[PDB]
Paper text:
The Mdm35 homologue in mammals is [name] ([name]; alias [name], [name]). Crystal structures of free [name] and the [name]-SLMO1 complex reveal how [name]-like domains could be stabilised during mitochondrial import and the location of a buried phospholipid-binding site.
[name] possesses a twin CX9C motif that is predicted to form two disulphide bonds within the oxidising environment of mitochondrial IMS 17. A striking difference in the structure of [name] is the prominence of an exposed hydrophobic stripe running the full length of the CX9C coiled coil domain (Fig1D). Remarkably, this extensive hydrophobic surface does not induce specific multimerisation of [name] when free in solution, as NMR line widths (Fig1B) and gel filtration chromatography profiles are consistent with a monomeric species under the conditions used in this study.
Residue numbers in the entry: 1 to 421
Write the structure that this text describes.
């Protein structure tokens, strides 16, 4: 299980994990407390599995959308920064990591997708998605192409899908409507249909992934890609001369990327919660800690005000913020995981031709809604069970029963299930 007196951090392999390891070395030099940074594959799915057994990292980095799920399953410690420390970060970043009235992580940086373009191939990038076919056709005649980006992660296509009206979950009055997923409407279909038509008219390849799109852009073969701040670093070392700009408009509407707050949460099973708090508040979330990470791979717009004021001079960051403001902060509810799985499949199926746009999205809507409501019914069940298991062991089995207290909890659960059907 987790080791006492040591910090183990998990963070995604596309981030500045070597720079974070330098912050960890500084912590060790000051305190003698070893910090180890790992980037396991699919860490966002591995974390819940290992943490549920009380193993895993002391600190986990991911975008904020996954944290509500982790918190709801009891996998994260509550965090309680002093007022003085909170005021060092932008208030909207705290909002992203608030779940059920509690803070469940520290906000690190704001990530949004932008359009990245090769200035030598394309000194004026297109303002609209509708121009892309004609641009591509021209470029293919010269043995180049217009645009390549990662089709295998729905994060990258969502901005298009959402531009004319696709959504995830309704929000109103402090509550997400989990019965209703917005992935099957006219705007969602128009967006995805545009994408599939790019593929059908040979302007993109259906199995373009992160690495193929990254190699194609940084080797000068394609004129544009869609990516986050983390990717700028590899383009810097390539021979490509790039700019970063607002995503193209669709049906005259802004693309709407789903905006992530890269966040650090503390494993509820960690024996090192105080050391983790010290590391995060006094080493990572400082101008020099963020600089060391940023130097490795750009973080984006950082949550820390003092450092963001220096980063705001970078036009790449201004573009990141332009796109962020046109997009939307992701929800952090546990259902988000089901939303993404379902959109991932729909995109891949429609892009590869395994399903039509209309059947792919209809099926995503159905499966996301079912699992989302299912996760609520499961939470109602778990609450019944906690009440019953408590009552049965401490009351019934001790011969001190005069009725089952946990009947209304069951009926609420029963109603959830029977309504879902
Ligand atoms: O593709 C769905 C995926 O989107 C987001 O993951 C992003 C992440 O926020 C970024 O930091 C970056 O690393 O790329 C990921 C996409 O590959 C969501 O945060 C994630 O929950 C979801 O599965």
């Amino acid at each position: 299980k987790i080791e006492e007196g040591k910090l183990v951090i998990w963070i995604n392999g596309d981030k500045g994990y070597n720079g974070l390891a330098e912050v960890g070395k500084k912590f060790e030099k000051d305190t003698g407390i070893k910090v180890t940074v790992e980037h396991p594959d699919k860490l966002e799915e591995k974390f819940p599995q290992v943490a549920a057994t009380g193993d895993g990292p002391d600190i986990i980095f991911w975008a904020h959308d996954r944290f509500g799920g982790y918190a709801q399953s009891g996998l994260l410690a509550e965090i309680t920064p002093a007022a003085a420390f909170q005021d060092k970060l932008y208030p909207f970043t705290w909002d992203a990591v608030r779940y059920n009235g509690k803070l469940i992580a520290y906000p690190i940086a704001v990530e949004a997708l932008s359009l990245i373009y090769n200035k030598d191939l394309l000194p004026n990038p297109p303002k609209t998605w509708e121009e892309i076919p004609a641009l591509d056709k021209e470029l293919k005649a010269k043995g180049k192409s217009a645009l390549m980006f990662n089709l295998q992660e729905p994060y990258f296509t969502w901005p298009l899908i959402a531009a004319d009206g696709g959504y995830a979950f309704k929000y109103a009055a402090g509550k997400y409507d989990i019965k209703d997923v917005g992935v099957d409407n006219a705007g969602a279909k128009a967006g995805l249909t545009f994408l599939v038509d790019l593929i059908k008219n040979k302007h993109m390849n259906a199995d373009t992934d992160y690495s193929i799109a990254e190699a194609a852009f940084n080797k000068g073969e394609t004129a544009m890609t869609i990516n986050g701040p983390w990717a700028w670093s590899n383009i810097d070392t390539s021979a490509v001369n790039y700019g970063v700009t607002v995503l193209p408009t669709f049906k005259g509407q802004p693309s709407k990327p789903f905006v992530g707050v890269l966040s650090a949460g503390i494993n509820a099973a960690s024996p090192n919660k105080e050391l983790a708090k010290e590391f995060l508040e006094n080493y990572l979330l400082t101008d020099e800690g963020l600089e060391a990470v940023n130097k490795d791979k750009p973080l984006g717009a950082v949550a820390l005000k003092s450092y963001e004021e220096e980063l705001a001079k970078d036009p790449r960051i201004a573009a990141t913020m332009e796109n962020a403001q046109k997009g939307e902060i992701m929800p952090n509810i546990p259902q988000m995981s089901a939303f993404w799985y379902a959109v991932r499949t729909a995109v891949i199926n429609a892009a590869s031709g395994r399903q039509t746009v209309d059947a792919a999205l209809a099926a995503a809507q159905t499966n996301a809604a079912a699992n989302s409501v299912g996760e609520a019914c499961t939470d109602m069940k778990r609450e019944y069970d906690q009440c019953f298991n408590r009552w049965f062991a401490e009351k019934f089995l001790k011969g001190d029963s005069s009725g089952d207290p946990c009947t209304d909890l069951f009926k609420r659960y029963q109603q959830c299930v029977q309504k879902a059907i």
